[PDB]
Amino acid sequence: GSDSGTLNYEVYKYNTNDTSIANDYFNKPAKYIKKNGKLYVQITVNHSHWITGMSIEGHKENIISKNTAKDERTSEFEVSKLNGKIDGKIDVYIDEKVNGKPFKYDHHYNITYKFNGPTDVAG
Ligand code: HEM
Ligand SMILES: [Cl-]
Ligand SMILES: [Zn+2]
Ligand SMILES: [Zn+2]
């Protein structure tokens, strides 16, 4: 195997096998890195300015890069596995026009990640 690379994943509605409304805001694929004996994923979101916070498996995002022009950011999370489901949280805050009409949105959600990374890279 390889201790770094890309991995496919999907974001599911919490504790279901259904695609989350959140899923479109997550760029695919992510990357993974194994370092200091631990496993990490590096996930890029779009509409970054709408997503005020993220955590996975109880760990808050560590923002490693931002692209202000594309309204994207890349966040690193420690994970217990590269293949399988891990619950996470996302905070969303929107206050701007949608189709010309003011829209406001302020929610904190649970989500379930399904990671489809390699099975031969252990912690
Ligand atoms: C204009 C933008 C958006 C609209 C109109 C919208 C609308 C909705 C609606 C109607 C629900 C169902 C709530 C319920 O029935 O209780 C929902 C749930 C949800 N939304 Fe939002 N949403 C928007 C943006 C976002 C964004 C940017 C994210 C995250 C990046 C997000 C993440 C979620 C999550 C995680 C749920 C819970 C159910 C699921 O996982 O699909 N939404 N949204
Ligand atoms: Cl979490
Ligand atoms: Zn809030
Ligand atoms: Zn809410």
Curated annotation (Swiss-Prot):
GO terms for cellular component: extracellular region; peptidoglycan-based cell wall. Transmembrane segments: none annotated. GO terms for molecular function: hemoglobin binding; metal ion binding. It is a peptidoglycan-anchor. Heme binds at S20, I21, Y105, Y109. Disulfide bonds: none annotated. The keyword Metal-binding applies. Induction: Repressed by fur in the presence of iron. Residues 3-123 form the NEAT domain. GO terms for biological process: heme transport. Keywords: Cell wall, Heme, Iron, Metal-binding, Peptidoglycan-anchor, Secreted, Signal. It is found in: Secreted, Cell wall. Monomer. Interacts with IsdA. Belongs to the IsdC family. Involved in heme (porphyrin) scavenging. Binds hemoglobin and almost exclusively free-base protoporphyrin IX. Probably has a role as the central conduit of the isd heme uptake system, i.e. mediates the transfer of the iron-containing nutrient from IsdABH to the membrane translocation system IsdDEF. Hemin-free IsdC (apo-IsdC) acquires hemin from hemin-containing IsdA (holo-IsdA) probably through the activated holo-IsdA-apo-IsdC complex and due to the higher affinity of apo-IsdC for the cofactor. The reaction is reversible. The NEAT domain binds Fe(3+) heme iron. Reduction of the high-spin Fe(3+) heme iron to high-spin Fe(2+) results in loss of the heme from the binding site of the protein due to the absence of a proximal histidine. This is Iron-regulated surface determinant protein C. It comes from Staphylococcus aureus (strain N315). The lineage of its organism: Bacteria, Bacillati, Bacillota, Bacilli, Bacillales. The gene is isdC.
